[PDB]
């Protein structure tokens, strides 16, 4: 419907370490997925099959657990959402009697909130992650070599990543999120100008209260793209680079650890920006219709 927020999944948060980034979608954590790639990475090794124990009962657990944990914060996320509906839509918020300023309080507060469920609920699953990993390092000390460990599964990996990559429409996420920026800082600098000649304080107050959710919404869409290109450019310098057929055991985990946590980054920001580029074009609608309300009313041209 007109100038509605009807999914607000682009909110996420870190800890207080910025180690762990908790996302709304599914898996929720980037390492659910580097779990899942080990599982891959296991298979090719007889010594390590303990893993398909410890995935199965483990990192599905940790990913129930981490589903449980944001559900909990549901009620949370129904408050904040109405609270933006509310300011981002003129005629809703006039069906009420609190101020505008006394809502975008209750905004703030609510948003942080609900931000802070999704952490404190998930705590005690971040814990597990590290303990997951650490057992994964443990477990690849089983591996039969030593100084002469075999990289062909590593490097197996690697070609099979470089053709998945491509499926990712980068260039595309790059021009999309410039023309963005580009029309988003134009339309902060319309309402600088118009604001001066134009009485309409809550069509402009709900203008600049979705653009200060679009400036967040393009935060986390470019921290995600970064980190995309990151992982594309150095999965690609390790196939262009030297291809040693042995290393050390202690090598062969940093190895693997190295492109699983590549790859998870990289599919969990495929997730984000899918969730963010919708994101972004629906709050962009809603500043359209309102500029649109506000010069409609003009009745002659402004200067
Ligand atoms: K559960
Ligand atoms: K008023
Ligand atoms: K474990
Ligand atoms: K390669």
């Known amino acids: 419907?007109?100038?509605?927020?009807?999914?607000?999944?682009?909110?996420?948060?870190?800890?207080?370490?910025?180690?762990?980034?908790?996302?709304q979608l599914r898996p929720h954590f980037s390492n659910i997925y580097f779990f899942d790639e080990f599982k891959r990475y296991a298979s090719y090794h007889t010594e390590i099959k303990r893993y398909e124990d410890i995935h199965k009962t483990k990192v599905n657990s940790?990913?129930?657990?981490?589903?449980?944990?944001?559900?909990?914060?549901?009620?949370?996320?129904?408050?904040?959402?109405?609270?933006?509906?509310?300011?981002?839509?003129?005629?809703?918020?006039?069906?009420?009697?609190?101020?505008?300023?006394?809502?975008?309080?209750?905004?703030?507060?609510?948003?942080?909130?609900?931000?802070?469920?999704?952490?404190?609920?998930?705590?005690?699953?971040?814990?597990?992650?590290?303990?997951?990993?650490?057992?994964?390092?443990?477990?690849?000390?089983?591996?039969?070599?030593?100084?002469?460990?075999?990289?062909?599964?590593?490097?197996?990996?690697?070609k099979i990543y470089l053709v998945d990559f491509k499926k990712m429409p980068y260039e595309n996420y790059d021009?999309?999120?410039?023309?963005?920026?580009?029309?988003?800082?134009?339309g902060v600098d319309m309402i600088?100008?118009?604001?001066?000649?134009?009485?309409?304080?809550?069509?402009?107050?709900?203008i600049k209260f979705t653009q200060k959710e679009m400036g967040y919404i393009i935060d986390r869409f470019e921290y995600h793209l970064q980190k995309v290109k990151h992982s594309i450019d150095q999965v690609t310098a390790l196939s262009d680079g030297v291809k040693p057929k042995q290393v050390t055991k202690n090598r062969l985990k940093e190895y693997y650890f190295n492109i699983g946590n590549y790859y998870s980054i990289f599919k969990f920001g495929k997730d984000?920006?899918?969730?963010?580029?919708?994101?972004?074009?629906?709050?962009?609608?809603?500043?359209?219709?309102?500029?649109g309300e506000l010069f409609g009313h003009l009745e002659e041209r402004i200067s």
């Open 1 to 23: 419907s007109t100038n509605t927020t009807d999914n607000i999944d682009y909110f996420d948060i870190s800890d207080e370490s910025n180690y762990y980034l908790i996302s």
């Open 62 to 158: 940790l990913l129930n657990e981490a589903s449980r944990a944001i559900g909990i914060c549901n009620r949370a996320k129904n408050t904040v959402k109405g609270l933006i509906n509310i300011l981002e839509n003129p005629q809703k918020f006039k069906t009420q009697r609190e101020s505008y300023d006394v809502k975008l309080r209750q905004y703030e507060e609510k948003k942080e909130a609900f931000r802070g469920c999704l952490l404190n609920k998930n705590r005690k699953n971040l814990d597990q992650i590290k303990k997951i990993n650490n057992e994964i390092r443990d477990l690849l000390e089983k591996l039969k070599c030593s100084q002469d460990c075999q990289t062909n599964v590593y490097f197996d990996m690697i």
């Open 175 to 186: 021009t999309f999120i410039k023309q963005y920026k580009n029309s988003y800082l134009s």
């Open 192 to 206: 600088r100008k118009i604001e001066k000649q134009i009485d309409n304080p809550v069509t402009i107050n709900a």
């Open 272 to 291: 984000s920006l899918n969730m963010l580029n919708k994101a972004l074009i629906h709050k962009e609608k809603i500043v359209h219709n309102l500029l």
